[PDB]
Amino acid sequence: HTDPMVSKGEELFTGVVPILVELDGDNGHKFSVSGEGEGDATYGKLTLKFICTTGKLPVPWPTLVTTLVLCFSRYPDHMKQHDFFKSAMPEGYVQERTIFFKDDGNYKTRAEVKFEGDTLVNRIELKGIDFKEDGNILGHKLEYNYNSHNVYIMADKQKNGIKSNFKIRHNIEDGSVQLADHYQQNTPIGDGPVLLPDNHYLSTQSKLSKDPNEKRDHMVLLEFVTAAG
Known part of the structure; x- marks a missing residue:
C-alpha cells in the first residue's frame, strides 16, 4: 500500500486472527454468551462458535448475530482508505446499537472491539426491555437461519467515526x-x-x-462480509 496508515491497519489482519467474543445480556432474563473462532480479513471469512454459558438462551440465536467484528470485512484494494474498523486498531473502537423489534422490545448494546495480543476481543453488554414474554423473541418463534444483507456505512465527522442503520428481517416459524x-x-x-x-x-x-457433539445451547456461524460501492 502506498498509504502507510493503510499498511498499519492491514498488517494486523494479514493472516488468520483468533477471535474471542463475550456478552453479558439482560424483560430481565440474565444470560451470558462466550464465542471463539478465527477471522480471515483477506477473505471476509468469519468462523465462530458461541456458547450460552448460563444455560438456556432466553432469546433466539439469530437475534444476536449482528451483536456478536466488522473489522474482518474484506475491503477491496481501491477501498482500503475507507476501512474505519481496521484503522482504529489495535486501540480499537466502540460499537453501539439499538435494535428495534417491530411490535416488541428493543436491544441496547455497547461493544468494545480491540486487540489483546494476537487475539481480537469483542466485549458486549446487552440490555433488552419492553419485550413480550410470549412474543416472538421471548417465546422462541423464530427460525434458525439468516439472510444476506447490504448495510449502508456513512461516516460521522463530528464523532470521528461511522454510523449506519439497516433492517434485519427474521423469519417467524409460521411463515x-x-x-x-x-x-x-x-x-x-x-x-x-x-x-x-x-x-x-x-x-x-x-x-x-x-455442532452434533455440543450439548450446551450454542450456535455455529459461518459469515462472509465484503465491502462494495
Whole structure:
C-alpha cells in the first residue's frame, strides 16, 4: 500500500486472527454468551462458535448475530482508505446499537472491539426491555437461519467515526417475518487518526449450524462480509 496508515491497519489482519467474543445480556432474563473462532480479513471469512454459558438462551440465536467484528470485512484494494474498523486498531473502537423489534422490545448494546495480543476481543453488554414474554423473541418463534444483507456505512465527522442503520428481517416459524430495525454508531477508542470513509456498502452472507457433539445451547456461524460501492 502506498498509504502507510493503510499498511498499519492491514498488517494486523494479514493472516488468520483468533477471535474471542463475550456478552453479558439482560424483560430481565440474565444470560451470558462466550464465542471463539478465527477471522480471515483477506477473505471476509468469519468462523465462530458461541456458547450460552448460563444455560438456556432466553432469546433466539439469530437475534444476536449482528451483536456478536466488522473489522474482518474484506475491503477491496481501491477501498482500503475507507476501512474505519481496521484503522482504529489495535486501540480499537466502540460499537453501539439499538435494535428495534417491530411490535416488541428493543436491544441496547455497547461493544468494545480491540486487540489483546494476537487475539481480537469483542466485549458486549446487552440490555433488552419492553419485550413480550410470549412474543416472538421471548417465546422462541423464530427460525434458525439468516439472510444476506447490504448495510449502508456513512461516516460521522463530528464523532470521528461511522454510523449506519439497516433492517434485519427474521423469519417467524409460521411463515411471517419479524423486523429488527438496527441503528448503529462506531467511535474510536484511542486518540490517534482513523479512516473516515465515504458512503459505501457491506455485503453480508451468513450460515447458522449446530455442532452434533455440543450439548450446551450454542450456535455455529459461518459469515462472509465484503465491502462494495
